[PDB]
Amino acid sequence: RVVAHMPGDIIIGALFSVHHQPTVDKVHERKCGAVREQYGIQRVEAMLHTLERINSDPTLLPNITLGCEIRDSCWHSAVALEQSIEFIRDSLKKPIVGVIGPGSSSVAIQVQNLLQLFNIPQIAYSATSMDLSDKTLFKYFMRVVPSDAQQARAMVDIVKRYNWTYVSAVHTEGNYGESGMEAFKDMSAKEGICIAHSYKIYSNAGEQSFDKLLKKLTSHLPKARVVACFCEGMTVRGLLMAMRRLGLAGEFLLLGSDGWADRYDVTDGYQREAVGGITIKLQSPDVKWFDDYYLKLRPETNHRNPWFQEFWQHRFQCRLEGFPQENSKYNKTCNSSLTLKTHHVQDSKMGFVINAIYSMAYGLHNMQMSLCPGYAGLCDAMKPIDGRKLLESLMKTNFTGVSGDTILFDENGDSPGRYEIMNFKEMGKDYFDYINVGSWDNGELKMDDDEVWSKKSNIIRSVCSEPCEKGQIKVIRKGEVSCCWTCTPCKENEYVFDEYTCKACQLGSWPTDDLTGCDLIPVQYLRWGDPEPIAAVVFACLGLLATLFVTVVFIIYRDTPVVKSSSRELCYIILAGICLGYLCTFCLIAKPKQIYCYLQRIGIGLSPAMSYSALVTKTNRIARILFMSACAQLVIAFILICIQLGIIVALFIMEPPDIMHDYPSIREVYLICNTTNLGVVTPLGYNGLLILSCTFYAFKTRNVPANFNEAKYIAFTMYTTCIIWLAFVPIYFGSNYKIITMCFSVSLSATVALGCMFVPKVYIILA
Amino acid sequence: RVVAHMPGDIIIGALFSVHHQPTVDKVHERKCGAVREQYGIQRVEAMLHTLERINSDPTLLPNITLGCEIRDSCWHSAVALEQSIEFIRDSLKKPIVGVIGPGSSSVAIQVQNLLQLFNIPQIAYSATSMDLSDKTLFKYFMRVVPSDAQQARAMVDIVKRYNWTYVSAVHTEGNYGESGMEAFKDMSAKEGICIAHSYKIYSNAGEQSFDKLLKKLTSHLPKARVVACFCEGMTVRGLLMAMRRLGLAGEFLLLGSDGWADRYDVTDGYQREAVGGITIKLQSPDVKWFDDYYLKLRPETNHRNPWFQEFWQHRFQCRLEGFPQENSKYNKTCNSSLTLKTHHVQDSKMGFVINAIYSMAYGLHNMQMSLCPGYAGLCDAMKPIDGRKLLESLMKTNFTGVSGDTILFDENGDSPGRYEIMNFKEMGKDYFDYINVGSWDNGELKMDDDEVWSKKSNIIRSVCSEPCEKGQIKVIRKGEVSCCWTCTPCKENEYVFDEYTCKACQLGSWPTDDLTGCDLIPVQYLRWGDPEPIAAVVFACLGLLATLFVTVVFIIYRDTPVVKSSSRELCYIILAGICLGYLCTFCLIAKPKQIYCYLQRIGIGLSPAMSYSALVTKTNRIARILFMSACAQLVIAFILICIQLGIIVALFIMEPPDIMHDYPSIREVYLICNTTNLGVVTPLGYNGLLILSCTFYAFKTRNVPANFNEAKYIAFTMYTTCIIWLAFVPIYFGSNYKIITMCFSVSLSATVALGCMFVPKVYIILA
């Protein structure tokens, strides 16, 4: 082979792909193919001129002359891996200190696995694999270009900015697409972004495969209107060609990496279906001072580049007469007026090639400054140059590049990313072009929203499920994507706990209007203003007036013959019973409390006993005439009263008094005291016997004219008492109006008893 | 440097460490040190003679001549890594096809990382790392020696054979010790073997460290009496020296790998504390035909070994006058009678060095036979020889070695292990030596137990905790080793479920004598043979005889004046009541069943009512004289009887009859029918009133001479009935003898009632 030398004191090695890689037939015999234009001569000339310029600089590396050795790589593993052997021989002729290259991202791994055994640092300018960031295996590798995990960050930032949350996924097969898509998925899963379904395809498959791809991506509209493509430059062309035939154009929004960034050869002839796509590029401004040097070169005055003459002949398709490398293949002869300005195109990677050399030079300068202080040249303590301190000098380099940007390496030897953002939209009648609409600068996304969309309302939307609403909980099924839910309402009984669940609050409570917390329903019970309680009260007042008049009459005229005929003490007992019958409505109708309920359950069982005991003993004595002392009768009446009171006390002991809350319905809550069925039924059963005996005896002795026909009135009264007790059961145990009916029943029975027994007596004594 | 050539058609490369590794001062300038004896010249001569022999063999590789190239390695990475570069350069002078070596186990990795980039297979004969078994990283590596995970298998087999289950652990720091101990732990954990505590130490630490190691290992006796050392040859010497001063000798049993296998320089001066140790060696019989060739060599007639003259001068410490490599350092001149037979020692690794060459030759022969069939030589389809088919030809080699053993490679390119087993025991008065006591041959441990231990009872034991016993469960504290448990007994109420837990069976059951399954206790209840039931039965029979006699007398003499004076029907009723009182003991004393308990609860409540009703109505009529028809009295008695039967039926409805199992104590189970307190107390309360009325009226009318002083006997009878009712309560409700006492009470009361009421009547009527 041929190697390009340049003398000096410190030697640098470079591997540049000047020719095409050998075909499969000549892999074992090499024989590289055709010469390259962009990658072949421009890089070699740039390195030579950069070294000349850095030597002419008196500020950097004073009195030290740097050299170089440039070798071919042919974009093939074998050739580079042989030239590396040739380098490491001379290392063991000054030794090589560092290597710049190679271009490929898979040759570099095989060259590193060889160069790290002999402690040689390596810097690459176009290798962007994600496997090269592991410093356990690749300890001597550094690069000035962003990794493949920086595009997956800009893509996530762009998606996050525009509020997209349900997208597709396409990627080619290989290390590039697979690693990029893995990074994209890992970064997007942390920002609440979900993928419909990830796909996979070659870059040269058949039309049937592309049609099936379209049919499988069409089965998600209109839920996933954005496609996240991390594919190469031909998968996009295949997708556009497939879209053309099915008539699906003007519907999708393809978001792609820099495989399809600014290449016109991807959308030629298919500009109608690619409108709207957003792509990211790699920022790289041109280098001004390289053109003023590259164009002045002439074949007759270029001797340090052995590849120059064949390059000239290939480019101009002619033959150079009188030259050491004349070729007989070309019949035409070159003219003396030929020049290189004709269709001159600058290389698209000319910045990193210079930045790598500058980084290595700065590392050497720092090592010399920190190792040979106070001296200008090669001090005795730095001969020869060891490759273990240079690796630590290089990692801490930090300077400014050719374009005013900052160059620095992190702990992994990587570099920060800087990307542009383009947009393919129609300019006019049959005219399409890319235009810059933003940039990404290591965390700061600066994008012009006005230019991308003509109107705000025209923004494409892609969301799976609409958000919930006023009082709408989230219900999610099993096996589905986390961002495809359903909104359902809680019932009126239960409020909403959080975004995910309802919650049912305890009885007696009710959710508020905001559905944030159940509040307590105020207790509701009877009211004085209702006509029924006031009617009961006025009835009771009339009854008290009547009984007061009757007792006043009897007290005033206690010596009358009528009073002498009857029994005074028994009449007083009956009057007291009637008064206590009247005076239970005030206790009953009031708001329930501690002792009020006890008084109401005591009076209802006491009042129907004291009067009826005396009345039954009187009627029993009268029937016996047809133990005659009044003291015995009073003792018997008091004994029966005591028995009734003992029964009442036993009922009290069985169930102690208490206040109770009623829950008839969810909406309303009442307030009724402790009142069971037993404590009411038992006194009724006990007092039924007395009235039954009274009725029997009154029927037996209903035809005696004693005491102005007293027996007739005594027999006629009982009918009402018995019929009232009878009617008191059904409607008491058949509705929710217990208080009013049990307040009217006792009063009505007492008033009929008082009006059918004593009214004739007072009427007769009056006149 | 210098390389040893040998011509031919196929070239093989070898790396042999002829010199000592350069010191730290000359690492960058090489300058290897002193010449080696075993590793330097013997291996080179063996390879040369082996190639000569295989060329002379007409049945292997016909008409093809093999060659070789031997280079130094100096046991250093740099020198071998330069000679490998020289090899792979000439591969790109016939190319090298394979490399044998190097000796070291860490240089080999660095040489493999270089040789696998250019597709060169490699075979090693003394590298035994466990990192070289990964074919993802080391695809071109093969070896004929067992890995370091084969000693960890023989150790586990030896420990498992002798029933040791609690051992210590010691290992030196490095790849060797750490990897071996990791393998040992992983293999031992699967066979129920536990480690007390693993340790770790240098091989050159201070005396204080070794003393601390002894003090930390002394804190486990006598539970861990076996130490599993996987350390190098100097850690054992340090342990012995440390044991010497503390006077701990003659106690331990050191089990070690082949770092301390047969080396006398480890137990010299300390044979007293190393007695009993068991070590494993590597099987390697000597090669006979190498000695007949190596000894005949002379310095004057050896020209193909450039290292020979310096070797001779170094070995004999003289100067070879008149030689191309004469040295002036040695003043003494060599003698013509010198020979190599003096102190000749064979290399200890001479078998694998030949087996590797034979394996490579067999691989080449197989590839030639399978690629150019029907031809004898180099066919046109095998020029040049590719290194990708040789790697697959080599992996399937399977043949017989020099010592009659089988050589084959598994999928990882490894080899099976074959080890010996030694023993360091005293032979006599101040004499110690190693003796073979077994072997391990890839799964078959053949070890002579009789020679290791003089007597069977002298076997050293090492177990943490004794096993459980006849009915003992396992309880293990938290945080302790799984093989250190406690054996505890279940109580008498529970049996043992499994080896780990007890279990308590249900009530009425009992664990058996074997403590494997709870069995049911047979039901136990009353017995006829007991004196109490038969006494009750004979008492009842006597009562039946008496009542039969009385009723026969009354039936025969129904027309007597005495019978006319009394009431016949009431007397018959009383007789029937007494009969039903007697005939409750037969129902009661029998084994409980469905209806027997119903009859016993019916008779006890019926008998004390139907007689006493008639008696009380008779006495009431007699007291009233001082409704006289007998029909009214009979109707009243029958009405009271019906009321009693109604109460009985109500009690029956309250609690339906049933059979019940009693559980007074865990050991015994009874059988008593359903009998609550209410069903017994209620009839007694009901029938107390009748007897109270009877006794009150009898006391009221106890002085009437009617009917031969019948009132006196009627008043005297009641006393006994009342007293028996009274006595029946305390002891009935105060012991577990309910049946006997309630059987005697009714019978006694009926007997006294029948004997104090009718006996005088029959006595008078008789005479």
Ligand SMILES: N#Cc1cccc(C(=O)Nc2cc(-c3ccccc3)nn2-c2ccccc2)c1
């Ligand atoms: N047989 C029978 C039978 C069946 C049911 C009930 C009653 C009864 O006791 N009626 C009654 C009589 C009196 C009474 C008291 C004092 C003065 C005049 C009358 N008040 N009450 C009464 C009791 C409870 C609720 C309503 C009313 C008897």
Ligand SMILES: N#Cc1cccc(C(=O)Nc2cc(-c3ccccc3)nn2-c2ccccc2)c1
């Ligand atoms: N006051 C009072 C009072 C208090 C407790 C118990 C009894 C009572 O009923 N005694 C009794 C009388 C007779 C009886 C029956 C028929 C013929 C002769 C005697 N048998 N029994 C009896 C009942 C239950 C268990 C044991 C014995 C009365």
